[PDB]
Nucleic acid binder design. Structure first.
Ligand SMILES: [Zn+2]
Ligand SMILES: [Zn+2]
Ligand SMILES: [Zn+2]
Length: 84
DNA sequence: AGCGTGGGCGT
DNA sequence: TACGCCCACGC
């Protein structure tokens, strides 16, 4: 990790410089992606993609056991474990 | 449950 | 750079 955050209060370090460039948005407060629906801003395009599903009700991820649908794969993952 | 949001990293 | 997921933490 040759790339450290130059911010005074922060001690984080990164392997790839591009990851620090993304991280630095936490301190500058830049949120480049906007929701056309509710006008809310987001720091990441991937998080913007999933936020919009809270409006459309789109749920691409169904549980392998019962078939209950989820907007994000991680919610389905958190759910599947309840069948154990 | 509903879902924000950072870290690791692949395309 | 710009984007897209997995994985995880958090409220
Ligand atoms: Zn920092
Ligand atoms: Zn929105
Ligand atoms: Zn299920």
């Amino acid at each position: 990790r040759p790339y450290a955050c130059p911010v005074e209060s922060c001690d984080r370090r990164f392997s790839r410089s591009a990851d620090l460039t993304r991280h630095i948005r936490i301190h500058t407060g830049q949120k480049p992606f906007q929701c056309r629906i509710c006008m809310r801003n987001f720091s990441r395009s991937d998080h913007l993609t999933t936020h919009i599903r809270t409006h459309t009700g789109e749920k691409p991820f169904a549980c392998d056991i019962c078939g209950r649908k989820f907007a994000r794969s991680d919610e389905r993952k958190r759910h599947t474990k309840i069948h154990l």
